[PDB]
Amino acid sequence: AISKNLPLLNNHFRKHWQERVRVHFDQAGKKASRRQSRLRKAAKIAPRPIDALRPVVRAPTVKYNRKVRAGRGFTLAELKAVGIAPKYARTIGISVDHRR
Amino acid sequence: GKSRGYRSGTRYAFQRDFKKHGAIPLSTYLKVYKVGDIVDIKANGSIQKGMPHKYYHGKTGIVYNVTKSSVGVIINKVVGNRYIEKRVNLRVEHVKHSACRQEFLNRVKSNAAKKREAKANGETVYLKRQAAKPRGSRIISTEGNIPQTLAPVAYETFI
Amino acid sequence: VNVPKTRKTYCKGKECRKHTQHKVTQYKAGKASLFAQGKRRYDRKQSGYGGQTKQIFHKKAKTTKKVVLRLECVVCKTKAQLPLKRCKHFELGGDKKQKGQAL
Amino acid sequence: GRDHTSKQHVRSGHRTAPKSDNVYLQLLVKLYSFLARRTDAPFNKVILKSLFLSKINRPPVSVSRISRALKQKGAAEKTIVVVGTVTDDNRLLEFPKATIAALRFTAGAKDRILKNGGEAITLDQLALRAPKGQNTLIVRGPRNSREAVRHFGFGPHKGKAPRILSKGRKFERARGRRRSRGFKV
Amino acid sequence: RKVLQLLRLTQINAGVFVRLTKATSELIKLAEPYVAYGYPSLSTIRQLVYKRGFGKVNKQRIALSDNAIIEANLGKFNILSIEDLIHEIYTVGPNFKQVSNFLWPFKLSNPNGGFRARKFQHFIQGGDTGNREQFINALVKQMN
Amino acid sequence: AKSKNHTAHNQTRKAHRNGIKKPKTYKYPSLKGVDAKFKRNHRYALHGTAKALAKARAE
RNA sequence: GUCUAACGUCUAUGCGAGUGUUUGGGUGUAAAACCCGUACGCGUAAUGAAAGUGAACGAAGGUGGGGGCCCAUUAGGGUGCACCAUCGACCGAUCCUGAUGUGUUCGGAUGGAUUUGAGUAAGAGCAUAGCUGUUGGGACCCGAAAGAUGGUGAACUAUGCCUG
RNA sequence: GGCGAAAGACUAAUCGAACCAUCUAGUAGCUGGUUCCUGCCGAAGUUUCCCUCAGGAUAGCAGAAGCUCGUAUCAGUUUUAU
RNA sequence: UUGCUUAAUUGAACGUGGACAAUUGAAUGAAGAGCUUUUAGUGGGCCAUUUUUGGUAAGCAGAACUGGCGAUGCGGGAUGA
RNA sequence: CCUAAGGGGGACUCAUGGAGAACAGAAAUCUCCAGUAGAACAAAAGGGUAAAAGUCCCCUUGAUUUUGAUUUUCAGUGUGAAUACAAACCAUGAAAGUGUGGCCUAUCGAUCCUUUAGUCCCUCGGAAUUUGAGGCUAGAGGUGCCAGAAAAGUUACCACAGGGAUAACUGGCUUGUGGCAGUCAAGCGUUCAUAGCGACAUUGCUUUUUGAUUCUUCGAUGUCGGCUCUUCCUAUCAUACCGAAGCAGAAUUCGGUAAGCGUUGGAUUGUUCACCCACUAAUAGGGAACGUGAGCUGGGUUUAGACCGUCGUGAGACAGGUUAGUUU
RNA sequence: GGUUGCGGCCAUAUCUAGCAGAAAGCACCGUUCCCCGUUCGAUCAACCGUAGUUAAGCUGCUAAGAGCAAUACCGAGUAGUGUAGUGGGAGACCAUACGCGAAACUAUUGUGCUGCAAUCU
Ligand SMILES: CC(=O)O[C@@H]1[C@@H](O)[C@H](O[C@H]2[C@H](OC(=O)[C@H]3CC[C@@H]4[C@H](C3)O[C@@]3(C[C@H](OC(=O)/C=C/c5ccccc5)[C@H](C)CO3)[C@]43CO3)O[C@H](C)[C@@H](O)[C@@H]2OC(C)=O)O[C@H](C)[C@H]1O
Ligand SMILES: [Mg+2]
Ligand SMILES: [Mg+2]
Ligand SMILES: [Mg+2]
Ligand SMILES: [Mg+2]
Ligand SMILES: [Mg+2]
Ligand SMILES: [Mg+2]
Ligand SMILES: [Mg+2]
Ligand SMILES: [Mg+2]
Ligand SMILES: [Mg+2]
Ligand SMILES: [Mg+2]
Ligand SMILES: [Mg+2]
Ligand SMILES: [Mg+2]
Ligand SMILES: [Mg+2]
Ligand SMILES: [Mg+2]
Ligand SMILES: [Mg+2]
Ligand SMILES: [Mg+2]
Ligand SMILES: [Mg+2]
Ligand SMILES: [Mg+2]
Ligand SMILES: [Mg+2]
Ligand SMILES: [Mg+2]
Ligand SMILES: [Mg+2]
Ligand SMILES: [Mg+2]
Ligand SMILES: [Mg+2]
Ligand SMILES: [Mg+2]
Ligand SMILES: [Mg+2]
Ligand SMILES: [Mg+2]
Ligand SMILES: [Mg+2]
Ligand SMILES: [Mg+2]
Ligand SMILES: [Mg+2]
Ligand SMILES: [Mg+2]
Ligand SMILES: [Mg+2]
Ligand SMILES: [Mg+2]
Ligand SMILES: [Mg+2]
Ligand SMILES: [Mg+2]
Ligand SMILES: [Mg+2]
Ligand SMILES: [Mg+2]
Ligand SMILES: [Mg+2]
Ligand SMILES: [Mg+2]
Ligand SMILES: [Mg+2]
Ligand SMILES: [Mg+2]
Ligand SMILES: [Mg+2]
Ligand SMILES: [Mg+2]
Ligand SMILES: [Mg+2]
Ligand SMILES: [Mg+2]
Ligand SMILES: [Mg+2]
Ligand SMILES: [Mg+2]
Ligand SMILES: [Mg+2]
Ligand SMILES: [Mg+2]
Ligand SMILES: [Mg+2]
Ligand SMILES: [Mg+2]
Ligand SMILES: [Mg+2]
Ligand SMILES: [Mg+2]
Ligand SMILES: [Mg+2]
Ligand SMILES: [Mg+2]
Ligand SMILES: [Mg+2]
Ligand SMILES: [Mg+2]
Ligand SMILES: [Mg+2]
Ligand SMILES: [Mg+2]
Ligand SMILES: [Mg+2]
Ligand SMILES: [Mg+2]
Ligand SMILES: [Mg+2]
Ligand SMILES: [Mg+2]
Ligand SMILES: [Mg+2]
Ligand SMILES: [Mg+2]
Ligand SMILES: [Mg+2]
Ligand SMILES: [Mg+2]
Ligand SMILES: [Mg+2]
Ligand SMILES: [Mg+2]
Ligand SMILES: [Mg+2]
Ligand SMILES: [Mg+2]
Ligand SMILES: [Mg+2]
Ligand SMILES: [Mg+2]
Ligand SMILES: [Mg+2]
Ligand SMILES: [Mg+2]
Ligand SMILES: [Mg+2]
Ligand SMILES: [Mg+2]
Ligand SMILES: [Mg+2]
Ligand SMILES: [Mg+2]
Ligand SMILES: [Mg+2]
Ligand SMILES: [Mg+2]
Ligand SMILES: [Mg+2]
Ligand SMILES: [Mg+2]
Ligand SMILES: [Mg+2]
Ligand SMILES: [Mg+2]
Ligand SMILES: [Mg+2]
Ligand SMILES: [Mg+2]
Ligand SMILES: [Mg+2]
Ligand SMILES: [Mg+2]
Ligand SMILES: [Mg+2]
Ligand SMILES: [Mg+2]
Ligand SMILES: [Mg+2]
Ligand SMILES: [Mg+2]
Ligand SMILES: [Mg+2]
Ligand SMILES: [Mg+2]
Ligand SMILES: [Mg+2]
Ligand SMILES: [Mg+2]
Ligand SMILES: [Mg+2]
Ligand SMILES: [Mg+2]
Ligand SMILES: [Mg+2]
Ligand SMILES: [Mg+2]
Ligand SMILES: [Mg+2]
Ligand SMILES: [Mg+2]
Ligand SMILES: [Mg+2]
Ligand SMILES: [Mg+2]
Ligand SMILES: [Mg+2]
Ligand SMILES: [Mg+2]
Ligand SMILES: [Mg+2]
Ligand SMILES: [Mg+2]
Ligand SMILES: [Mg+2]
Ligand SMILES: [Mg+2]
Ligand SMILES: [Mg+2]
Ligand SMILES: [Mg+2]
Ligand SMILES: [Mg+2]
Ligand SMILES: [Mg+2]
Ligand SMILES: [Mg+2]
Ligand SMILES: [Mg+2]
Ligand SMILES: [Mg+2]
Ligand SMILES: [Mg+2]
Ligand SMILES: [Mg+2]
Ligand SMILES: [Mg+2]
Ligand SMILES: [Mg+2]
Ligand SMILES: [Mg+2]
Ligand SMILES: [Mg+2]
Ligand SMILES: [Mg+2]
Ligand SMILES: [Mg+2]
Ligand SMILES: [Mg+2]
Ligand SMILES: [Mg+2]
Ligand SMILES: [Mg+2]
Ligand SMILES: [Mg+2]
Ligand SMILES: [Mg+2]
Ligand SMILES: [Mg+2]
Ligand SMILES: [Mg+2]
Ligand SMILES: [Mg+2]
Ligand SMILES: [Mg+2]
Ligand SMILES: [Mg+2]
Ligand SMILES: [Mg+2]
Ligand SMILES: [Mg+2]
Ligand SMILES: [Mg+2]
Ligand SMILES: [Mg+2]
Ligand SMILES: [Mg+2]
Ligand SMILES: [Mg+2]
Ligand SMILES: [Mg+2]
Ligand SMILES: [Mg+2]
Ligand SMILES: [Mg+2]
Ligand SMILES: [Mg+2]
Ligand SMILES: [Mg+2]
Ligand SMILES: [Mg+2]
Ligand SMILES: [Mg+2]
Ligand SMILES: [Mg+2]
Ligand SMILES: [Mg+2]
Ligand SMILES: [Mg+2]
Ligand SMILES: [Mg+2]
Ligand SMILES: [Mg+2]
Ligand SMILES: [Mg+2]
Ligand SMILES: [Mg+2]
Ligand SMILES: [Mg+2]
Ligand SMILES: [Mg+2]
Ligand SMILES: [Mg+2]
Ligand SMILES: [Mg+2]
Ligand SMILES: [Mg+2]
Ligand SMILES: [Mg+2]
Ligand SMILES: [Mg+2]
Ligand SMILES: [Zn+2]
């Protein structure tokens, strides 16, 4: 059971693992269907853009201090500073975040 | 029950020589050992500190370390299909200089002396040793030594 | 075995670094705390059903124990520990041997 | 019958050809098989043997190794020969003008050699300007720096690297690696 | 076995020349129960070298069919001919070692007329092993 | 049951197929186990020796 | 004696202090081929339980060898990559010493030590594939006596009852 | 579980714990088997540890891949000295 | 050269420079020497000569060295590991 | 087991013998001489030791601290044990020196947990203080199956995987044991070793005893005895022919050639064996897979039911007794 | 050459019994105030070199001496042993072949050699 100068392994296969094997044969099919869904959304709302405007926020933790990424919504103070009500902003393609 | 202690089976190996027990003659403590010296190992039963194991009794090796009362000797021991380098710390009572050095070191001097003499005389000399060769021809004089004839003797009982 | 109640050995205390006088005492194991993590873990594992969850030693073979001397420096109060060999009989500061006496 | 003093029918144990099926490496072997067979120059016989070597037997030569070899006394204008890949070294502060013949050059290496006025030629171009390897200097990369060699000859008190998947305080550090946990080897 | 290997006697009916001293004498003494040896005459050496003489050239067994092979391999030892080689063997010369090691071990046939009734006993006791001295010439005559 | 207890038969055959090899000799033996006091000073003597030879060649 | 997840050695290949397009996005003659990039994985730094600290005295060291190359002219000299043996240097841990100073208990300069690390000492790795070997999986194929869960039986039979 | 004027007896030819399906391809250091050719090489039953004694791990013996070199310095042998 | 050692300018170890040239220091041999990685099977043995233990002995049990059988056909021992 | 029985130094010389001294004798204490160790050194044995390692006295704690290297077992892993040094701090001695437990070779113990000592150092992760907890290094608590599970029985109701790697038949080697036979001849035999015997010794044979072993068989060779029947051996009980006698006859005993020919009926017992009764010329001993169960029988042994005695708390055991129990 | 001090090898030096010993040395020898140690100035410590002696120690010589050491036409190429045979013998064991080769025994000879320093008829 233990033999030779080999690394000691941790292969977690002592349960009925073979009843829960998900093989993504449909990777290409989901890619294609996602593109078709995306086309449908675009044709549904044209010429209105498919993407809501997202804010820019600093990433948390000491490891991602340096990076900055897309947030979820503009703060109430930020929308107040440009004179847009959040209820109105959600209807003109602007994302709101009451939490930030 | 098996017994396999450190000094098992050393009843006669570690005995003192007959009529040679007791105090150590002091030339043993006056000899000087240098790193690289070739030494014979012979355990002295009367000194139990720095005593060799029974394997090294009768072995010859190279001094590698010199301490207050001891020398370190390098021995090559067979372990299976190879040699392992063994480093044994031995008090100088169990150690003696090997006499094999003095024969070869003298032959080196003799070869050097003979070569310069032949070089001085402008001749050549051969320094390689030779095994004993079959003897040459010879003439046996029989003056006073005329051959005496022997015969096998009859059987006798002497009790 | 008889061991005197005082001894002069090396003291490892930073102040001393030398042989000083020490007080010899037999070491006694301290009381087992209830909040040591191994005892904390043991109580949790034994709780509930399942019976005895850890082994109980039975096959005793030793008939003695190693005596440990507690050496307290009289100068700096630093303690030191010395284990002795296995002895069936041990006294500390007993009556010293009297050689030459009669039966 | 014969009392055999050696094993019978034993292959030499050396490569006599590349294991590679690259046709262009065969052409280089074609050229130096002819050169080694016919020039009496020891350089060409060495090159032919080195062309057979496996990837781990031709470790990459950094452009820093060539710089140090050219810094030998009287070797500044020698032709550096590398039977293998020449890699770049971004830790160098400067590189000289040099002629280097190699199997392969990295993008940084070729840029650096040509930037400093040198040439980056192949081994067939070497064979015409130096058919006997005159005024050359063969450079080999470090063989014992490979990661697999860390674990070779592992054992007690050998100081080699354990074959291990994770590294940390919980991974092969307690008993046999520490006197407080029994012994240490 | 090691002694026979060091004498290059690794098959039956293999013959080799040995210069008698002490080291080689104690060697032959160790191999004595397995070999027949003796003192060869000049004609025996000549016949051996002429019919079954081979040289070791690049570790190959090459027939001694021309004096150029001998010169090319032993001219630095002053051997330029097959007769130089025979002389160097017979009157044991200063280059006996090189000449005898250059000679491939002679691969003789079995005796024409057979051996004695039982080989593996000393020549003195009516067998074939050991030193037969001048009868080595008759034995080689049977086998070469 | 009862089996064979011990035998050294065939063990010299196995040791002599590829072993019975004398150890290689090198010009410099390892100084492992040599006296620390000598080893400490031998470090200073060798370092000074290298300096003297370096200066003589630099001249 | 298989396939798979994760691995050891060796080999071939691409690129190389980097490497891996395929999670995803683009694209398409549509599960293909072609294209894209942020991250991330591994590698590029180790050591200590940790707080932490963190790799050039020197031409990135000396000595004895060392293929090849250079000068020669048997010989001889120079240079000597890989690699071997040996003596050193640097980083971390452990122990010793303890400068100017100071939240007076912190700081830790400087100089050391038969101690110790899977380190540095002009990077070698990453990825794909193949054989062989390993571990978990039904695990080369067939094989228990057993254990568990949930159900079906008193048409035989055992016993009680009711009616003949 | 039943049932037993008690034999561990009867409980559908099944009883010292029925039948049916599933967990289940249960596990087995133990049996048995294990499918084409030729070529080259070619063993071990020995060391140490193991609730180890029909089994493993470990070292040894063997194969394969080779690598650095090219007579360098090796040997199941002798001689001489000790 | 040193921080070791000596009363020392004594030694210890490692060195610079110089001399001793192919009989460079016995024989014989050498399908060359050295090195590395990885992995199989095996881990019941038995026999012969000699040494040898227990036992009255054993086609018995147990060791030593070597050679064999096992794993091996061929000629002989009629037959036979 | 030992605060000395460890360490250092010093002084002395033990076992024993001889010759002497009131009580005093084989043994009390004193004296001289001799005394190579013939003693003593904790303990088994071996080695070692004499101005000592033994005996006595004085001083002590080196039986201490930090850890590396090495030797043995060895895989050159662990453990145990030991060796020579490095850096300290000490003891002793005038000093040189010696001392890192016991003169040497045995005298012992991992992970996990706990506890103590040390560093008073690191952490409890939003920041602190103090408790508490967790870390690092060294000991102790222990695994004696001693490289170290936590562990009672029974099955005659029984199961499975296997094993001739291993017992219970036959067979094979051996022949202690059993059985049978020789030789040497001290004695026996009224005299008289050998008509017939024959001690102390010693040489053999046999395989109908019992041992010894475990080679064959455990995907099975039907394990007792009897009945029935055939054949073979001879170490011959009877019958034939002979030789010998301590053979007058009659009877009897020993032997040679001899297995041609026969060797029984019953009471008790499952018996093999035994023992009795009786006839007979005699009622010899054996083999043939301890011949012979697809020939029988099934009394015994040895499944399951049941009784008793002894044993066991009990389930149950008994190679103890008893009764019933499928022979294809 | 003798002698002393310090030695190396550690009996050719030891052991027993006799005899001899010039010079110097050594020794025995004389004393107890002092340092010191004892039951005892016997040992140990100290003092004198003054009163005496080679009696002893020590040294040398003697002994068909014991022991020890060395040697060998001593025993003996014996015992033993490595290797060999399809040698002998029922066996136990034995012979032969190529090699190695004792111990006891017997005889003879010997009985310390020597280094450093100082000293002496
Ligand atoms: C009553 C009784 O006798 O049973 C005790 C049991 O009570 C004890 O359980 C303790 C329990 O034991 C364990 O968890 C294991 C820890 C280590 C293992 C083992 C038991 O102890 C061992 C064995 C051996 O030392 C002993 O034996 C330990 C005795 C002990 C007793 C009390 C507390 C701690 C230890 C090794 C030296 C290492 O330590 C170890 C490797 O086997 O630890 C808890 C902390 C304690 O509370 C608990 O003690 C109490 C009061 O019940 O474990 C012992 C082995 C049993 O003998
Ligand atoms: Mg016993
Ligand atoms: Mg014994
Ligand atoms: Mg001896
Ligand atoms: Mg000791
Ligand atoms: Mg010459
Ligand atoms: Mg203290
Ligand atoms: Mg803890
Ligand atoms: Mg709870
Ligand atoms: Mg509860
Ligand atoms: Mg539970
Ligand atoms: Mg529980
Ligand atoms: Mg052939
Ligand atoms: Mg072969
Ligand atoms: Mg080779
Ligand atoms: Mg350039
Ligand atoms: Mg590197
Ligand atoms: Mg590395
Ligand atoms: Mg790894
Ligand atoms: Mg691992
Ligand atoms: Mg020859
Ligand atoms: Mg012979
Ligand atoms: Mg004819
Ligand atoms: Mg014919
Ligand atoms: Mg004939
Ligand atoms: Mg003939
Ligand atoms: Mg014939
Ligand atoms: Mg014949
Ligand atoms: Mg004859
Ligand atoms: Mg012919
Ligand atoms: Mg068994
Ligand atoms: Mg076995
Ligand atoms: Mg070999
Ligand atoms: Mg992989
Ligand atoms: Mg794709
Ligand atoms: Mg599609
Ligand atoms: Mg990254
Ligand atoms: Mg990256
Ligand atoms: Mg990384
Ligand atoms: Mg730490
Ligand atoms: Mg540390
Ligand atoms: Mg200040
Ligand atoms: Mg200040
Ligand atoms: Mg200050
Ligand atoms: Mg500062
Ligand atoms: Mg390091
Ligand atoms: Mg590096
Ligand atoms: Mg598998
Ligand atoms: Mg698998
Ligand atoms: Mg199944
Ligand atoms: Mg089931
Ligand atoms: Mg269960
Ligand atoms: Mg149910
Ligand atoms: Mg159920
Ligand atoms: Mg009914
Ligand atoms: Mg129920
Ligand atoms: Mg119910
Ligand atoms: Mg019942
Ligand atoms: Mg019923
Ligand atoms: Mg049914
Ligand atoms: Mg049914
Ligand atoms: Mg039916
Ligand atoms: Mg049924
Ligand atoms: Mg299966
Ligand atoms: Mg072969
Ligand atoms: Mg088993
Ligand atoms: Mg194995
Ligand atoms: Mg082996
Ligand atoms: Mg191999
Ligand atoms: Mg070599
Ligand atoms: Mg010899
Ligand atoms: Mg000699
Ligand atoms: Mg020189
Ligand atoms: Mg010679
Ligand atoms: Mg393998
Ligand atoms: Mg292997
Ligand atoms: Mg293996
Ligand atoms: Mg295996
Ligand atoms: Mg077997
Ligand atoms: Mg097996
Ligand atoms: Mg044989
Ligand atoms: Mg024989
Ligand atoms: Mg046997
Ligand atoms: Mg057997
Ligand atoms: Mg087999
Ligand atoms: Mg054969
Ligand atoms: Mg045949
Ligand atoms: Mg045959
Ligand atoms: Mg026959
Ligand atoms: Mg003592
Ligand atoms: Mg004492
Ligand atoms: Mg004492
Ligand atoms: Mg004393
Ligand atoms: Mg006496
Ligand atoms: Mg202790
Ligand atoms: Mg050990
Ligand atoms: Mg052990
Ligand atoms: Mg080991
Ligand atoms: Mg070891
Ligand atoms: Mg150890
Ligand atoms: Mg030792
Ligand atoms: Mg000391
Ligand atoms: Mg413990
Ligand atoms: Mg554990
Ligand atoms: Mg918190
Ligand atoms: Mg905090
Ligand atoms: Mg412990
Ligand atoms: Mg065990
Ligand atoms: Mg065990
Ligand atoms: Mg148990
Ligand atoms: Mg049970
Ligand atoms: Mg029953
Ligand atoms: Mg029963
Ligand atoms: Mg059997
Ligand atoms: Mg008998
Ligand atoms: Mg009998
Ligand atoms: Mg009789
Ligand atoms: Mg029998
Ligand atoms: Mg049987
Ligand atoms: Mg059976
Ligand atoms: Mg069958
Ligand atoms: Mg059968
Ligand atoms: Mg049947
Ligand atoms: Mg049968
Ligand atoms: Mg049967
Ligand atoms: Mg039958
Ligand atoms: Mg039966
Ligand atoms: Mg008859
Ligand atoms: Mg008839
Ligand atoms: Mg009846
Ligand atoms: Mg009847
Ligand atoms: Mg009876
Ligand atoms: Mg039968
Ligand atoms: Mg029969
Ligand atoms: Mg029978
Ligand atoms: Mg029968
Ligand atoms: Mg029948
Ligand atoms: Mg039947
Ligand atoms: Mg029957
Ligand atoms: Mg019928
Ligand atoms: Mg029956
Ligand atoms: Mg019956
Ligand atoms: Mg009965
Ligand atoms: Mg019954
Ligand atoms: Mg009762
Ligand atoms: Mg009874
Ligand atoms: Mg009964
Ligand atoms: Mg009755
Ligand atoms: Mg009935
Ligand atoms: Mg039927
Ligand atoms: Mg004179
Ligand atoms: Mg005078
Ligand atoms: Mg006086
Ligand atoms: Mg005095
Ligand atoms: Mg006088
Ligand atoms: Mg006088
Ligand atoms: Mg005398
Ligand atoms: Mg013989
Ligand atoms: Mg031999
Ligand atoms: Mg023979
Ligand atoms: Mg014949
Ligand atoms: Mg002879
Ligand atoms: Mg005398
Ligand atoms: Zn203190």
As given in the structure block, the two tokens for residue B52 are 């060799």
List all nucleotides in chain K with at least one atom under 7 A from a protein Cβ.
7-11, 83-87, 96-99
Q: Which residues line ligand 1 (CB under 6 A)?
A: C 32, 38-39, 42, 54-57
A vs D: CB pairs below 8 A: 11
Which residue in B139, B109, B141 sits closest to B127, CA to CA? B109
Cα–Cα separations (whole angstroms), residue E142 to D162, E115, E136: 69, 9, 10
- CB B60, CB B39: distance < 8 Å: yes
Tell me how far apart the alpha carbons of residues B126 and E94 are, in angstroms, rounded to a whole number: 12
- CB E106, CB E45: distance < 8 Å: no
Question: Which residues make beta-bridge pairs with C73?
Answer: C22
As given in the structure block, the two tokens for residue B93 are 């009572």
Give the Cβ contact number of residue E139 at 10 Å.
19
As given in the structure block, the two tokens for residue B71 are 């020398």
Tell me how far apart the alpha carbons of residues E108 and E11 are, in angstroms, rounded to a whole number: 10
Give the pairing of strands D99-105 and D119-121. parallel
Q: B2: CA distance to ligand 80 center in Å?
A: 27
How many residues appear in chain F?
59
Which residue in D119, D139, D113 sits closest to D47, CA to CA? D139
Give the pairing of strands B82-91 and B70-79. antiparallel
Question: Which residues make beta-bridge pairs with D85?
Answer: D104
How many residues appear in chain E?
144
E-strand spans in A1-100?
56-58, 68-70
Indicate yes or no: strand K within 7 A of the C-beta of E55.
no
Tell me how far apart the alpha carbons of residues E111 and E94 are, in angstroms, rounded to a whole number: 33
D 1-40 → E contacts, CB under 8 A: 1-5
Q: How many whole angstroms from its chain centre is CA B100?
A: 6
Q: What is the DSSP letter of D44?
A: H
Which residue in E55, E13, E11, E8 sits closest to E143, CA to CA? E13
As given in the structure block, the two tokens for residue B2 are 């098996």
Question: Reduced to 3 states, what is the DSSP secondary structure of residue C85?
Answer: strand
Tell me how far apart the alpha carbons of residues D48 and D53 are, in angstroms, rounded to a whole number: 10
Can you give the resolution of this entry in Å?
3.2
Tell me how far apart the alpha carbons of residues A21 and A30 are, in angstroms, rounded to a whole number: 18
For E133, the enclosing helix (H) or strand (E) is strand E130-133
For C71, the enclosing helix (H) or strand (E) is strand C66-73
Tell me how far apart the alpha carbons of residues B52 and B67 are, in angstroms, rounded to a whole number: 16
Report which protein residue has its CA nearest ligand 1's atom 27.
C57
Tell me how far apart the alpha carbons of residues E42 and B18 are, in angstroms, rounded to a whole number: 61
Tell me how far apart the alpha carbons of residues E30 and E129 are, in angstroms, rounded to a whole number: 12
What DSSP line would sit under E50-76, residue for residue? HHH-EEEETTEEEE--SHHHHHHHHGG
Calculate how close chain B gets to E11, using CA atoms only, in Å.
28
Tell me how far apart the alpha carbons of residues A96 and A75 are, in angstroms, rounded to a whole number: 6
Tell me how far apart the alpha carbons of residues E85 and E96 are, in angstroms, rounded to a whole number: 9
The terminus-to-terminus CA distance of chain E in angstroms comes to: 25
State the residue for tokens 């008090």.
Answer: B91
The interaxial angle of helices D107-115 and D63-70, nearest 10 deg, is 40
Question: Reduced to 3 states, what is the DSSP secondary structure of residue C44?
Answer: helix
Give the Cβ contact number of residue C20 at 10 Å.
19
Ramachandran sector of residue F47 (left: φ over 0; alpha: ψ -120 to 50; beta: rest): alpha
- CB D154, CB A5: distance < 8 Å: yes
- CB E14, CB E54: distance < 8 Å: no
Beta-carbon-side half-sphere exposure of residue A54 (alpha carbons within 13 Å): 9
For C67, the enclosing helix (H) or strand (E) is strand C66-73
Q: Which residue is nearest to nucleotide G81 (CA to C1')?
A: D139
Tell me the nt nearest to F3, Cα to C1'.
I44
Q: What is the DSSP letter of C4?
A: -
What phi, psi does C11 have (nearest 5°)? -105, 125
Give the pairing of strands D79-87 and D61-62. parallel
Cα–Cα separations (whole angstroms), residue C83 to B123, C25, C32, C87: 80, 12, 21, 11
State the residue for tokens 């509930």.
Answer: C48
List all nucleotides in chain G with at least one atom under 7 A from a protein Cβ.
5-18, 22-28, 30-32, 39, 49-50, 57, 59-60, 62-64, 67-70, 78-89, 96, 113-114, 117-119, 122-126, 133-139
Indicate yes or no: strand I within 7 A of the C-beta of B112.
yes
Peptide bond preceding A47: is omega within 30 degrees of 0, i.e. cis? yes
Residue D51 exposed, middle or buried by CB count within 10 Å (0-12, 13-18, 19+): buried
- C-beta contacts of A7-12 below 8 A and 24+ residues apart: A7/D163, A7/D164, A7/D165, A8/D164, A8/D165, A9/D165, A10/D165
> What technique was this entry resolved by?
X-ray
What phi, psi does E88 have (nearest 5°)? -65, -35
Tell me how far apart the alpha carbons of residues D161 and D146 are, in angstroms, rounded to a whole number: 12
As given in the structure block, the two tokens for residue C54 are 């850890």
- CB E2, CB D3: distance < 8 Å: no
Which residue in E19, E140, E47 sits closest to E7, CA to CA? E19
Q: B26: CA distance to ligand 94 center in Å?
A: 28
State the residue for tokens 């209820």.
Answer: A87
- CB E85, CB E104: distance < 8 Å: no
Q: From the CA of F5 to the C1' of I64: give the distance in Å.
A: 14
Tell me the nt nearest to E118, Cα to C1'.
K85
What phi, psi does D87 have (nearest 5°)? -100, 165
What DSSP line would sit under B79-146, residue for residue? ETTEEEEEEEEEEGGGEEE-THHHHHHHHHHHHHHHHHHHHHTT--------PPPPP-------TT-P
Report which protein residue has its CA nearest ligand 1's atom 28.
C57
- CB D58, CB D28: distance < 8 Å: no
Which one of the ligands is nearest to D181 CA?
Answer: 107
- Contacts for A75 with CB less than 8 Å, ≥ 6 apart: A55, A97, A98, A100
What phi, psi does C90 have (nearest 5°)? -150, 120
- Contacts for A18 with CB less than 8 Å, ≥ 6 apart: none
What phi, psi does D99 have (nearest 5°)? -110, 120
As given in the structure block, the two tokens for residue C82 are 């010395």
What DSSP line would sit under B33-69, residue for residue? --TT-EEEE---TT--TTPPPTTTTT-EEEEEEE-SS
Tell me how far apart the alpha carbons of residues B55 and B89 are, in angstroms, rounded to a whole number: 14
Task: Round the CA-based radius of gyration of chain C to a whole number and report it.
Answer: 21
Which residue in E22, E30, E25, E23 sits closest to E5, CA to CA? E30
Tell me how far apart the alpha carbons of residues C58 and C36 are, in angstroms, rounded to a whole number: 24
Give the Cβ contact number of residue B109 at 10 Å.
10
Q: How many whole angstroms from its chain centre is CA E89?
A: 10
Amino acid identity of F34? Answer: V
Tell me how far apart the alpha carbons of residues E94 and E100 are, in angstroms, rounded to a whole number: 12
Tell me how far apart the alpha carbons of residues C74 and C76 are, in angstroms, rounded to a whole number: 6
Tell me how far apart the alpha carbons of residues D123 and D104 are, in angstroms, rounded to a whole number: 9
